[PDB]
Amino acid sequence: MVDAFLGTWKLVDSKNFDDYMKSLGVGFATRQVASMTKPTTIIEKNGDILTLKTHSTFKNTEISFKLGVEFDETTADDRKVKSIVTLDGGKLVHLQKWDGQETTLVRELIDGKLILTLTHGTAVCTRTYEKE
């Protein structure tokens, strides 16, 4: 049911990522480098366990999770969060909670592109990935 999200994806557009990073308290030097980084995201499944890798020249992450089951996560910017990833209206919705704060990372497929919408506070970032 998540199968169309599976594969290797490369960043091809980014809007308002600096705003999103600023909202999370990311320092200017990290924002600078991140603004010029194009990650590759790899989404794999093995039964109902998904693994989502984000690789780049700057930072790398990897999470594994079951849909609908909370997991601990330590984000690229070193937040220690409680996370859950579900399918909602055909979109893969990742919610992170820490210290009463929350952020959503929503992935949807539009015309074969994967669109990642990041929301924290008032900041809304839209990043577009294309399939490799």
Ligand X SMILES: CCCCC/C=C\C/C=C\CCCCCCCC(=O)O
Q: Could you give the string, one character per residue 1-30, with x where binding to ligand X holds by CB under 6 A and - elsewhere? A: ----------x---------x----x---x
**Residue 128 within binding range of ligand X, rule CB under 6 A:** no
**Residue 127 within binding range of ligand X, rule CB under 6 A:** yes
Q: Which of 75, 101, 119, 128 binds ligand X (CB under 6 A)?
A: 75
Q: DSSP string of 39-86?
A: -EEEEEEETTEEEEEEE-SS--EEEEEETTS-EEEE-TT--EEEEEEE
**Residue 54 within binding range of ligand X, rule CB under 6 A:** yes
Q: Which of 7, 8, 16, 77 binds ligand X (CB under 6 A)?
A: 77
- Indicate the DSSP class of residue 16: S
**Can you say which residues are annotated as belonging to the binding site for (9Z)-octadecenoate?**
127-129
